From a paper:
Similar to the crystal structure of ZmB6T1C9/ZmAPT2, we discovered a substrate tunnel in the AtSOBER1 protein, though severely impaired by a two amino acid insertion (LP63-64) into the loop that constitutes the tunnel lid. The insertion of the second-amino acid (P64) pushes the following residue (F65) into the tunnel, which is positioned in the middle of the hydrophobic tunnel and could act as a hydrophobic anchor for the lid. The two amino acid insertion is conserved within the entire family clade, well aligning with the leucine at the tunnel entrance and the phenylalanine in the center of the tunnel, the latter of which is in most cases a phenylalanine or a leucine. In contrast to Zea mays acyl-protein thioesterase 2 and in agreement with Cunnac et al. (2007), Arabidopsis SOBER1 displayed a clear preference for pNP acetate. We found B-factors of the loop as low as the rest of the protein in AtSOBER1, and increased B-factors in the acyl-protein thioesterases APT1 and ZmB6T1C9/ZmAPT2. This indicated that in AtSOBER1 all protein parts retained a similar rigidity, whereas in APT1 and ZmB6T1C9/ZmAPT2 the loop had a higher flexibility than the rest of the protein.
Both proteins fold into a canonical α/β hydrolase architecture and superpose with a root-mean-square deviation (RMSD) of atomic positions of 1.54 Å over 210 amino acid residues. We found that a loop constituting the hydrophobic tunnel lid is the major component determining substrate turnover rate and substrate specificity.
Numbering used by the authors: 2 to 211
Write the structure that this text describes.
């Protein structure tokens, strides 16, 4: 069956820069999968004093701590673009439970928002070193089926760009929302992707495909 993996890059990065990630998923189950690595528009970014770069949504403050300010309206605009991608792939014949959304840092925050607001259950959302980009006021708007999408959250314990504490803060948020989240901490890892972290995501996607 057709598998679709949408990967969302982090702040200032691009889709093509991250496309080689797919070569790290060498299993026969995942080499069949269709990948998409979109690029965020060029936007001013508040944490960089308005400097323009590829950015999914405005980031008021980086490093991101528990309690850091967020721009909820801007995240919700970015979710619309992600949802258009997902809608198209499903309409073209892909089973929603074969759709996986992954992302790093800003892209992980967007992954979380996009999955939890999508009207259908998806295969899963993999957050790498992200943060929760809205407050608990949004939970009432999570569609019924979205709460059944599993989340795998990966975070380095030594991350000082998006504090590990901010990644841990997603867990009581997801529990309040009724969402199942596996949290995988990576000791000594900072704000980057490790191969062992990607290998675990692959195993998790394979298990979800069942």
């Amino acid at each position: 069956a057709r598998t679709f993996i949408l990967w969302l890059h982090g702040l200032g990065d691009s889709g093509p820069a991250n496309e080689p990630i797919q070569t790290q998923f060498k299993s026969s189950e995942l080499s069949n999968a269709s990948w998409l690595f979109p690029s965020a528009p060029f936007n001013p970014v508040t944490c960089n004093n308005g400097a323009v770069m590829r950015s999914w949504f405005d980031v008021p403050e980086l490093p991101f701590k528990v309690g850091s300010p967020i721009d909820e309206s801007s995240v919700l605009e970015a979710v619309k673009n992600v949802h258009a991608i997902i809608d198209q792939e499903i309409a073209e014949g892909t089973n929603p439970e074969n759709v996986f959304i992954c992302g790093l840092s800003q892209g992980g925050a967007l992954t979380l928002a996009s999955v939890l607001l999508y009207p259908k259950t998806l295969g899963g959302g993999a957050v790498l070193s992200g943060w929760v980009p809205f407050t608990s006021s949004i939970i009432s708007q999570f569609p019924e089926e979205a709460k059944k999408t599993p989340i795998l959250w990966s975070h380095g314990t030594d991350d000082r760009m998006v504090l590990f504490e901010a990644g841990q803060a997603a867990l009581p948020f997801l529990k309040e929302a009724g969402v199942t989240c596996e949290f995988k901490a990576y000791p000594g890892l900072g704000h980057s992707i490790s191969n062992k972290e990607l290998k675990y995501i692959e195993s998790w996607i394979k298990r979800r495909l069942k």
